[PDB]
Amino acid sequence: DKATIPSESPFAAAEVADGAIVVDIAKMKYETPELHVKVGDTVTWINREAMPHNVHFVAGVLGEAALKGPMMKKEQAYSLTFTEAGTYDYHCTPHPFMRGKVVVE
Ligand SMILES: [Cu+2]
């Protein structure tokens, strides 16, 4: 896997690690649809709206199988730590029109 997952379950926005690299989700969009980070960084998505959202990576992207993240409720978060350079596209399972990518340098 080209990513590790600190927590399988979503957690509270207030529980996000200091100096976290945050991508907010609001208005049915990932606020930073093109995020650039370095190898070893942890990316955290935070849902700021009542409609649940997730991040879903298709099979072959971060590993052999698809990585379908859990649904985040309002003010819930979810992290992924990227261990290899590359460009990783993702989308929201229930709302596939919501798309983003993280470019690991
Ligand atoms: Cu969504």
Swiss-Prot record:
Pathway terms, separated by semicolons: One-carbon metabolism; methylamine degradation
Cofactor requirement: Cu cation
Cofactor notes: Binds 1 copper ion per subunit.
Cellular-component GO terms for this entry: periplasmic space
Main location: periplasm
Keyword annotations from UniProtKB, A to Z: Copper, Electron transport, Metal-binding, Periplasm, Signal, Transport
Domain of life where this protein originates: Bacteria
Binding site for Cu cation: H53, C92, H95, M98
Role summary: Primary acceptor of electrons from methylamine dehydrogenase. Passes those electrons on either a soluble cytochrome c or to pseudoazurin.
Protein name in UniProt: Amicyanin
Organism whose genome encodes this protein: Paracoccus denitrificans
